[PDB]
């Protein structure tokens, strides 16, 4: 499942990750066709919508 996302906006939305699965996530590695260099980040905050 690919995603439509931009590095400039830190907000991200995930489809199939339930609240229980959400707890415990720290690190996210993402690679976008926009920029050749891949990126890594900390998941500072988790919110339920």
């Amino acid at each position: 499942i690919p995603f439509n996302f931009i590095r400039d906006r830190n907000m991200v939305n995930l489809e199939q990750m339930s609240w229980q699965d959400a707890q415990g996530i720290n690190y996210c590695t993402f690679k976008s066709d926009f920029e050749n260099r891949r990126y890594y980040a900390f998941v500072n905050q988790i919110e339920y919508v």
């Binding site: 499942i1 690919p2 995603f3 439509n4 996302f5 991200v12 939305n13 995930l14 919508v49």
Partner: peptide, 20 residues
């Protein structure tokens, strides 16, 4: 109402969404 960024094909005419 809110939509995830996961290329969810949405059809305005008939699409019905279960979640808020």
């Amino acid at each position: 109402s809110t939509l995830p960024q996961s290329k969810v094909n949405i059809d305005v005419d008939n699409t019905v969404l279960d979640y808020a």
